[PDB]
Amino acid sequence: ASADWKPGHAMPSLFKVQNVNLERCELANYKQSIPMPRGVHMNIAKYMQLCQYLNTCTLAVPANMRVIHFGAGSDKGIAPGTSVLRQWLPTDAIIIDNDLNEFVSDADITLFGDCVTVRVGQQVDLVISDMYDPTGSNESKALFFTYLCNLINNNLALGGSVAIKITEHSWSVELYELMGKFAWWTVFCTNANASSSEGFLLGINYLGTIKENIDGGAMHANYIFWRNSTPMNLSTYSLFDLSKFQLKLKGTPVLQLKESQINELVISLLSQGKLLIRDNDTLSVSTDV
């Protein structure tokens, strides 16, 4: 059972190309929960498995890497996911995190309040979102998704990536369509939470231009069809060997370029995870009014 030793499952192109109606998500394992190794928060296992999958992706990993983490508060007032990011990322990476209510965190900067109050002054390299609102037919939601879509279009370095939590009912047409502006994309479901319709929508290496035309509503129907078609066993076996857990120290270069200078070579380097385009100044992410 190789898949149980993997960190989770990624939506294959076999289901990306389907054409189906949106159906209810019905998972065989429901209400079945996984025991947590060593009395550890479930979010430790979930974030670690997300990181392990991102280790197989062509992430750009520069010096002074800029990481923003939304929905970082959990388990009444703490942020295990942020601590996992600190364990995973380069020691010189900057972590900014955010959630509605107060919590204590190992981030470099922690901002409380609605994500709309997080003012990203300069483009970032990696966005992690676990935002989920607790609140009849399943239509595209708006909420913080409007904010995230705007962030991808404006505040994300070319070559940067995103990992954004969605579920059967918490999802956005526009966010699926923005995955078409990355070199590669998928939905990733951790083995630790495989009995939930949760998935992480992954956009790897932002290109700022449409590489794949995606019908967002159709693609969410494809995502549910995939979940309905795919046995996934709860498992944290991938965490049994952590000797290679940390993100590779790639030294990815950061270049400033005009849009007119972005040619075939640059698009190729961005698409392979070998380049970021953004400012190389010192970062500033503040609270708005």
């Binding site: 190794p37 060593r38 009395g39 550890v40 928060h41 430790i44 296992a45 670690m48 388990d75 009444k76 007032g77 703490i78 942020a79 295990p80 942020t82 601590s83 996992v84 600190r86 364990q87 020691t91 107060e102 204590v104 965190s105 190992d106 981030a107 470099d108 965490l239 060997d241 952590l242 000797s243 857990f245 940390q246």
Partner: protein, 124 residues
């Protein structure tokens, strides 16, 4: 539970939060729980406070802010620096002490030259 809120409330009613906490747990009070225990290859150097997890086979690694009394209770840090020694870092706790990680950190000091815990690793 509501007991975390209880002891975290208590240390706001005192001029010596370190003593309030230690006296509380030494008298049988429930230690603070919900500390952020990480999963690690227990192949680290074993120093007290580290930028990455460094647990040996006899230790567990915690997210630093979650085992800091001052961070958890949202009160002023004692350090002349004003900056927390744990927040943003990882803290190694001897495995025999995991029942109360906050109480351990309040009760011990890393070696100044050696950076291991005095009595739990420091050979100076």
């Amino acid at each position: 539970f509501a007991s975390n809120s209880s002891v975290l409330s208590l240390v706001n009613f005192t001029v010596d939060p370190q003593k309030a906490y230690l006296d509380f747990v030494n008298a049988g009070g429930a230690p603070l729980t919900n500390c952020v225990k990480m999963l690690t290859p227990k192949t680290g150097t074993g120093i007290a406070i580290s930028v990455k997890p460094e647990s040996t086979a006899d230790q567990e690694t915690y997210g630093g802010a979650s085992v800091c009394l001052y961070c958890r209770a949202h009160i002023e840090h004692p350090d002349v620096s004003g900056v927390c020694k744990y927040k943003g870092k990882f803290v190694q706790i001897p495995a025999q002490c995991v029942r109360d990680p906050v109480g351990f950190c309040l009760s011990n000091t890393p070696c100044n030259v050696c950076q291991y815990w005095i009595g739990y690793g420091c050979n100076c």
